[PDB]
Amino acid sequence: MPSPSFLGSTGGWLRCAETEEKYAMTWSSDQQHIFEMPTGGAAVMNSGDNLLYLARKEQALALATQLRTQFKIQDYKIYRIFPSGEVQYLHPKDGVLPYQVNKGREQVGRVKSTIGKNVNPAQV
Amino acid sequence: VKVVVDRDVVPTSFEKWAKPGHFSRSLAKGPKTTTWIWNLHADAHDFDSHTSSLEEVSRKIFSAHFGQLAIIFIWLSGMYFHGARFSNYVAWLSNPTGIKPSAQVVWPIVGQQILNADVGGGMQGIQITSGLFQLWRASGIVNELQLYVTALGGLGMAGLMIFAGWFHYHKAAPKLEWFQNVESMLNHHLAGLLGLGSLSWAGHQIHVSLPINKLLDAGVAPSSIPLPHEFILNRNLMAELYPSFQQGLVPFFTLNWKQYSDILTFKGGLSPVTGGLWLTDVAHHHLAIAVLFLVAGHMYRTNWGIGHSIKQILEAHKGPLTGEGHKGLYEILTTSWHANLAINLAMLGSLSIIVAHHMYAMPPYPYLATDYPTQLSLFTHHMWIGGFCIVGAGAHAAIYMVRDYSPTVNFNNVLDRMIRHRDAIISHLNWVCIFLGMHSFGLYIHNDTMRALGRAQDMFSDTAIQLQPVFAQWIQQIHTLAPGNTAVNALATASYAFGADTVTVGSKIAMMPIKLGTADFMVHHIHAFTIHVTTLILLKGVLYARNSRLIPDKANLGFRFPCDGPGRGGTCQVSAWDHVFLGLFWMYNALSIVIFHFSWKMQSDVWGTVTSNGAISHITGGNFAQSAITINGWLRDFLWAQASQVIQSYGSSLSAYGLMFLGAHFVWAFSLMFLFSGRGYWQELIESIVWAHNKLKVAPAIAPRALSITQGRAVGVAHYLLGGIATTWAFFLARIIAVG
Amino acid sequence: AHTVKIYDNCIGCTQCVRACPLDVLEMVPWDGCKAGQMASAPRTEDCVGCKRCETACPTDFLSIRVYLGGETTRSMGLAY
Amino acid sequence: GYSFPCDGPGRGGTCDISAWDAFYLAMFWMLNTIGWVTFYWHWKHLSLWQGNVAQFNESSTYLMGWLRDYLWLNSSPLINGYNPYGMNSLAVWSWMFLFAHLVWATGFMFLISWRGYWQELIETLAWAHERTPLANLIRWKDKPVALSIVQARLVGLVHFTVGYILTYAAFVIASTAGKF
Amino acid sequence: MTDYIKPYNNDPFVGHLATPINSSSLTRAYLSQLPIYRRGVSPFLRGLEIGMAHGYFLIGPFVQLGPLRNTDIKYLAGLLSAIGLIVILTLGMLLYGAVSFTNDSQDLESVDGWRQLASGFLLGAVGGAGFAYLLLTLFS
Amino acid sequence: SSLRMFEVSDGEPYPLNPAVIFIALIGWSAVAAIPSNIPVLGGTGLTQAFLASIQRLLAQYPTGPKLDDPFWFYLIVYHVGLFALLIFGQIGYAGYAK
Ligand SMILES: CC1=C(C/C=C(\C)CCC[C@H](C)CCC[C@H](C)CCCC(C)C)C(=O)c2ccccc2C1=O
Ligand SMILES: CC1=C(C/C=C(\C)CCC[C@H](C)CCC[C@H](C)CCCC(C)C)C(=O)c2ccccc2C1=O
Ligand code: SF4
Ligand code: SF4
Ligand code: SF4
């Protein structure tokens, strides 16, 4: 997919990036613009969705946070596993995490006092 | 170019002074915390952290310019006063050698009158090392009346600047349009300030030189000195002291310039009468600089259409490795008040160091080379000034990527590349630092091992012949043969530090052909090590200030922030301001080693005495021919033998330089309280004291809290430097007075 | 990796996911609060533990705790 | 537990808050206080070994007497272990006194500056590792990281201790055996 | 024509993907020609030249600058320290293949070809220290 | 010792070997720096070295600087001239076509 062009190397051709899981984001980009990578200088944003490679998860979420402040665009980030497993970890509900959703659940939640008592009565 | 003034914008009222923190609504409504007390002063000078209207930020910094300028004028107007009311400048004008400098007296209150150093000239006091007497003698000042008139004339100029910084603001105010005239700004700074400044002082030392040159160097009493106006009211007096003044601006138009050769010369070297550079070479020098600045001050677009401009100049420079090079740099410097300050602090900071070097190399003032305390003090003075200034250049070149850099507005692909291949710049500098460290200080470990081990230092003598007198020796030889050959109009070298075997002595050695050897290659590379590390950490803070690999959302946090948290293994001290905080420390180590090198090597091989039965006998006779190669000699013959001149002074008048010496270690080790502990433990420490304060209700409304995480480090470096300069300040001012 | 435990002090002002870098927590409908939201962290395997939610956490004693546990590639935030 | 970094840089800051941080703070006072007792005890014998007791009870009242007559005069045979002429027996000790100030000041690297700066620098080193040809074939096992916030202070305390211990372990032998 | 072909292709047709001073388009081919990672060869030869290059100059430093450098015997101190460090370095380099154990199917860059180049490195280092050994003897 | 002319493609080792010769002329000066190795190298070469060797700064060692000064002067003259050609190369070059 047409992606922004960047010069300066650094990010690409890293063995660790090849052997480790990589992140792939995308954005609508209805208009030609110019933005900045969280790890690079400046680059021109082309029309349509744009797929890039990222080596860190915080790098994958800070770019989405930066895009939301510019214009109003829904963001999609997909997180791939080492072999070839591609799972949708960002927006599995497709609803924005701060806003309220219907699909609700509780993971790792202790409902005890506040000073301590670290024992968990039930994990699920 | 247009007179666009916004007359009356801010009124003159004491209302804002009644509110502590009027400059920020965040620092006004909630003063309920001790931390607010420190935030009121930490952000008091961070003018870009208040309002964003550049028409007001430019109308808050040019105000601080005139304010600081008024402070400097109040500071200078007192120096002419102290050298008249209680001093010895007139007696020193008659007898310059036996009378030590002094311009500060103490009072009989608690027995402190022991500080009244017996300097001579019928006046006792405290010795001075500011170069005031040399500057005043080079200015033709003789009588005390000429001091008071200059001081009273300084009060007027000092008041006018307060009524100016209070004029273009509470009374007047130029628009924002008056500041994008950078083209019109360099046409008045390089021609009106630099040009007319280098010309006005040039026209002074042509008619004021003979009260110093053709009088005070002959042997006339200060009472027999005529008046400066008696030489101008009668052109024939100037004509007799210089047989070129009879013409009086007649061959100046005829282009018969050679007829003005009695004051305008290019001799070189020093004068064997005064003790410094020639009084006639500096006049011609400033004339040559003045005309050059009158030409260089016409380079940018005014309002007539001719000349270049910072715009298209940078819009034209390209380059293969640069890509879209130099373009947009105009928008970089014309929009961010900050952006100009780093290049200024960088150039002017290196400038103070370079001029410090030019001080001791060729002494420009009469009776300055023999005055060893003043010379030693002035070099290291400007040395540390430029150290602070260059680190401030890094402090703000780090500000730019965070506060005023955008991926749409201002653009240079050169700066883009400095941030695109940013991981390569520091990688190069890193390997350079390590190579210059594991060897330069590695060889120190090596030689210090060779001595304590035995016969290894003996076999190191042949290597001691290496490196030293191998490089830079031919450069000095070039300068020996530079006059006559590559300088037909020069009868002397650039300085007598270049001319071999040529020694100029005026009862005390002024300059020496600094014969490098033994360990100058060692200390110069200790310098280069501490220079590359300083440039590395500061340039790291510059270009990593925007895009960081660890935390991608770096621009959100800020510049003077603590960190992020215990995540990622530990994110701690990652701000560019901390690269400056530690950058101040490696600059500290750099300037410390440089001042050590300069100071001690001087009396090692340069500074000394002369007798007729022999030749040259130094204060400390050629010691660092061996005591510099190892670390031990730097505290066996250097840091050890200095206690005999700083402590053995209580029986004399140099007792204060011992108290400050031993007391500067106190505040330095007091910095070891903040640079090692954490706010968490100390915040648990207040709440117990606040419990005792809640027991008697003596708890203040202002809730006691610990210092900020960043403020603690700012105070820590403040004490590490203050306690880390006042010791060598007391040391440089200890021996040089006893061995003067 | 790190162990995320949510106190009962929650007000549901979404301060977690607003502050949080890689979205460890998540807002879930709950029947025992004023605003009606509760923070929950399913992706605790990806948590780094930067402790920026305790800053934005309003309560007297914070409502979102993350006790320091083991360290893996997901919790070190390294790109290699 | 006992050894943990902080609670979070917020709510004013929790820098050095664990009980282990209190231990790491306490060791600093231990070395200096136990060194005060020794600096005092080192005069109550060298003043009578030379027989001139009138030095102490007259000059030790002020700190400058502690500076000029102990840290300077007694250190003459120490530093003169290997002079630029004839080195003698007190060479190995005069070397240790320097190697001490090295190790001691080496600790100042781990104590004054924290850990994140080293993370951002080690990442550049790792980048240069795989990017450089020939050397790209060499690969490590455990990923290079900086010391833990707890282990940083502990290892730096190890340096601040042993360097200080050797700082006083080389002065005693040489300075006492030089003049007896 | 969008932006007129990337401001002059970022100046006269740079390109140079695997070049930026790591190895020029001539030097990257020189690396393929270089025997340390030479194409079309396996067992011994990928090494061998490694030792014949390293051990050849390992005689250098300790002949003129080593801890022994002031008598006539000092021509041997440059070789004893070199050969001792050669044995140490050979063990240290051979241990890398023992640490690696993931690419047992890729025998070249992992274990088999790795030892089948360090095997040449041993004879190369020792022999190369002996090759430059007999080069300065006729002039002395 | 020879001209080393052969192919037009041999025109890229021609900027390669002098590129090594510059560094070789630098390294040759670097390797002959020891104050003790100069006495043993100059005896066989010169007839003057029989009576005594080493001329310090009297003649032989200034030849290096007296070899640099002409080369610097040559390059200075050629660039001062190049600034006066006003966009027209008046010096022949062995390029164009192959
Ligand atoms: C002591 C200390 C504090 C506490 C620092 C404090 C409390 C500063 C105290 C300074 C003030 C100026 C002293 C109180 C004096 C009052 C202002 C009263 C003055 C009234 C008249 C004398 C004018 C920290 O916050 C801290 C944080 C991180 C690492 C180390 C430390 C640390 O060591
Ligand atoms: C250099 C440095 C590192 C990096 C430290 C590293 C990479 C450790 C390097 C160790 C090398 C391998 C040498 C270790 C060998 C020692 C000379 C002796 C140890 C041998 C036994 C005692 C175990 C940090 O992690 C750090 C963290 C927090 C504050 C400051 C710093 C800091 O200054
Ligand atoms: S930080 Fe606590 S109170 Fe705030 S929204 Fe999250 S769970 Fe609710
Ligand atoms: S532990 Fe760190 S990453 Fe996880 S939710 Fe809290 S602040 Fe965010
Ligand atoms: S609270 Fe202190 S130890 Fe913890 S991350 Fe912040 S600076 Fe580091």
Task: Take atom 11 of ligand 1 and give the residue whose Cα is closest.
Answer: B707
Name, in order, each residue with C-beta under 8 angstroms of D175's C-beta and a sequence gap of 6 or more.
Answer: D74, D75, D77, D78
Domain ranges of chain A: 1-124
**Beta-carbon count within 10 A of E34 CB:** 16
CATH number, domain of B479, equals 1.20.1130.10
Chain D interface includes C68 (CB < 8 A): yes
Chain C residues closer than 8 Å to B568 by CB: 48-50, 75-78
Nearest CA in chain E to D129: E22
- What residues in C contact A112, CB-CB < 8 Å? 8
Comparing CA positions, the residue from C45, C35, C51, C50 lying closest to residue C70 is C45
Nearest chain B residue to E69 by CA distance is B459
Sequence length of chain B is 740
Return all residues near B699 (Cβ < 8 A) that are at least 6 apart.
B690, B693
Q: Please, what are the domains in chain C? A: 1-80 (3.30.70.20)
- Chain F: nearest CA to B296, how far in angstroms? 22
When CB atoms are compared, the residue of B319, B320, B459 closest to E69 is B459
Q: Nearest to residue B297, comparing CAs of B287, B286, B305, B308? A: B308
Distance between alpha carbon F9 and the CA centroid of its chain, in Å?
25
- Closest chain A residue to the Cα of D124, Cα to Cα: A10
User: Best substitution site from C16, C75, C76 to test ligand 4's pocket, by max atoms within 8 Å of Cβ?
Assistant: C16
Distances (CA, A) of E7 to B324, B545, D142, E13: 7, 28, 44, 10
Interatomic CA distance for residues E125 and E120, integer angstroms: 8
Diameter of chain A measured on Cα atoms = 55
How do A23-26 and A33-36 pair as beta strands? unpaired
Cβ pair B552:A39 closer than 8 A: yes
Q: How far is CA D3 from the centre of its chain?
A: 23
Q: What is the DSSP letter of B703?
A: B
Angle, nearest 10°, between helix axes B145-165 and B54-82?
Answer: 170
**Distance to chain C for A117, nearest Cα, Å:** 11
Enumerate residues 139 to 178 of chain D having a beta carbon within 8 A of any beta carbon in chain E: 139, 141
Contact residues for A43 (Cβ-Cβ < 8 A; gap 6+):
A4, A5, A6, A34, A35, A36, A37
Let me know: does B297 contact B192? Beta carbons within 8 Å. Answer: yes
User: D80 is written with which tokens?
Assistant: 């003169």
From chain E, the residues in CB contact with D137 under 8 A are 37, 109
Distance between alpha carbon B67 and the CA centroid of its chain, in Å? 20
Phi/psi for E53 (5° steps) reads -95, -40
- Comparing CA positions, the residue from B711, D9, B561 lying closest to residue D17 is D9
Report residue B505: phi and psi, to 5°: -130, 130
Partnered with residue B617 across adjacent β-strands are B609
Expressed in Å, this structure's resolution amounts to 4.0
- Rounded Cα distance between B242 and B252, Å, is 16
Please give the angle made by the CA atoms of D85, D87 and D88, to the nearest 5 degrees. Answer: 145
Q: Interior CA angle at B482 toward B476 and B485, to 5°?
A: 150
H or E, element range at B528: helix B520-543
Residue with tokens 């941080």: D21
Whether chain E has a CB inside 8 Å of the CB on D132: the answer is yes
Distance, in Å, from the CA atom of B413 to the CA atom of B332, rounded to the nearest integer, reads: 12
**Residues 6 or more apart whose Cβ sits within 8 Å of residue B204:** none
Q: Could you give the angle at the alpha carbon of D117 between the alpha carbons of D116 and D119, nearest 5°?
A: 60
Q: Could you give the angle at which helices D19-41 and B679-695 cross, rounded to 10 degrees?
A: 90
Residues within a 6 A CB radius of ligand 4:
B 567; C 16, 20-22, 24-25, 47-53, 66
| Yes or no, beta carbons of C79 and D123 under 8 Å apart | yes
The number of residues making up chain A comes to 124
CA–CA separation, A102 and C28 (whole Å): 8
What are the beta bridge partners of residue A33? A45
**C-alpha span between B104 and B119 (Å, rounded):** 11
Helix axes D116-131, B422-438, angle to 10 degrees: 100
Dist CA B556 CA A65 (whole Å): 11
Contact state of A60 with C44 under an 8 Å Cβ cutoff:
no
**CB–CB of B77/B158 below 8 Å?**
yes
Token pair listed for A34:
């110019």
Residue F35 · residue B466 · CB < 8 Å: yes
Question: Hey, how many other C-beta atoms are within 10 angstroms of the C-beta on D105?
Answer: 12
E133's tokens: 């050994």
Beta bridge partners of B571: B565
C33 is in an annotated binding site: no
Tell me how many degrees the CA angle C20-C23-C27 measures, rounded to the nearest 5. 95
Beta strand B608-610 with B616-618 is antiparallel
Burial A80-104 (b: 16+ CB within 10 A, else e): eeeeeeeeebbbeeeeebbeeeeee
- The chains in contact with chain B, meaning 3 or more Cβ pairs closer than 8 Å, are A, C, D, E, F
* Residue E85, number of CB atoms within 10 A of its CB: 16
Terminal CA-CA length for chain D = 52
Closest Cα to residue B177, out of B4, B378, B356, B355?
A: B4
Cβ atoms within 10 Å of B422's Cβ, excluding its own: 26
Out of C6, C13, C30, C38, mutate this one to test ligand 3's pocket (max ligand atoms within 8 Å of CB): namely C13
The class (CATH top level) of A1-124 is alpha beta
Q: What radius of gyration, in Å, describes the C-alpha atoms of chain F?
A: 20
Task: State whether residue B317 sits within 8 Å of chain E by CB.
Answer: no
Residue B699, token pair as written in the block: 């708890």
Residue in this structure with the two tokens 């709510």, named with its chain if needed: D11
CA dist B101 and B113 (Å) reads 17
Distance CA A62, CA A77 (A): 11
To which residue do tokens 């500060």 refer?
B104
Residue appearing with tokens 């081919």:
E29
The residue among B274, B414, B278, B399 whose CA lies nearest residue B337 is B399
Question: For chain F, how long is the longest CA-to-CA vector?
Answer: 58
CA dihedral over B275, B277, B278, B280, signed as positive or negative: negative
Q: Is B572 annotated as a binding residue?
A: yes
Phi, psi of C21 (to 5 degrees): -75, -55
Q: Which H or E run includes B162?
A: helix B145-165
Query: How far is CA E73 from each of CA B264, E70, E80, rounded to the nearest angstrom?
Result: 67, 8, 11
Query: Which tokens is B6 given?
Result: 């916004």
Taking a C-beta distance cutoff of 8 angstroms, is the pair B734, B649 a contact?
Answer: yes
β pairing state of C3-6 and C64-67:
antiparallel
B709 touches chain C (CB under 8 A): no
Q: Using the Cα atoms of residue B11, residue B14, residue B16 and residue B21 in order, give the sign of their dihedral.
A: positive
Domain that holds residue B406: 1-740
The CA–CA distances, whole Å, from B288 to B266, B299, B661, D24 equal 11, 19, 45, 64
For C75, the 3-state DSSP assignment is: helix
Q: Please state the separation of Cα B476 from the chain's center in Å.
A: 27
Rounded CA-CA distance B661/B656 in Å is 8
**Nearest C-alpha in D relative to A14:** D130
The first and second tokens of residue B710, run together, are 């960043």
Do B552 and A56 lie within an 8 Å CB cutoff?
A: yes
- Burial degree of A12 (CB within 10 A; 0-12, 13-18, 19+): exposed
> B372: closest CA among B131, B610, B592, B136?
B131
For tokens 């960190």, name the residue.
B563
Task: Give the number of the ligand closest to the Cα of residue B719.
Answer: 1
The experimental technique used to determine this model is X-ray
Rounded Cα distance between B90 and B147, Å, is 11
Please tell me the distance from the alpha carbon of residue D50 to that of residue D41, in angstroms, as a whole number.
Answer: 15
Compute the half-sphere exposure of residue B27: CA atoms within 13 Å on the CB side of its CA. 19
Task: Give the three-state DSSP class for B617.
Answer: strand
Cβ within 8 Å of residue D92, ≥6 positions away: B452, D81
Minimal CA–CA distance to A37: which of A80, A74, A76, A8?
A: A8
Q: DSSP assignment of E29-76, as one string?
A: HHHHHSGGG-SS--TTSTTTHHHHHHHHHTTHHHHHTSS--SSSTHHH
Is D164 marked as binding a ligand? no
Secondary structure letter of residue B317 according to DSSP: -
The DSSP element (H or E) to which C23 belongs, if any, is none
Do C2 and C69 touch, CB atoms closer than 8 A? yes
A102 CB within 8 Å of a chain C CB? yes
**Cβ distance B327 to B412 under 8 Å?**
yes
Q: Which of A7, A39, A42 sits opposite B549 (nearest CB)?
A: A39
Phi/psi of residue B554, each to 5°?
Answer: -85, -35
Q: Do B573 and D116 touch (CB under 8 A)?
A: yes
What number of C-beta contacts closer than 8 Å exist between B and F?
11
Residues within 6 Å of ligand 2 by CB: D 109-110, 113-115, 118, 146-147, 152
Task: State the distance from the centre of ligand 4 to the C-alpha of F63, rounded, in angstroms.
Answer: 71
Angle (nearest 5°) at CA B423 between B417 and B425: 70
Q: What is the 3-state secondary structure (H, E, C) of chain D?
A: CCCCCCCCCCCCCCCCCCHHHHHHHHHHHHHHHHHHHHHHHCHHHHHHHCCCHHHHHHHCCCHHHHHHCCCCCCCHHHHHHHCCCCCCCCHHHHHHHHHHHHHHHHHHHHHHCCCHHHHHHHHHHHHHHHHCCCHHHCCCCCCCCCCCHHHHHHHHHHHHHHHHHHHHHHHHHHHHHHHC
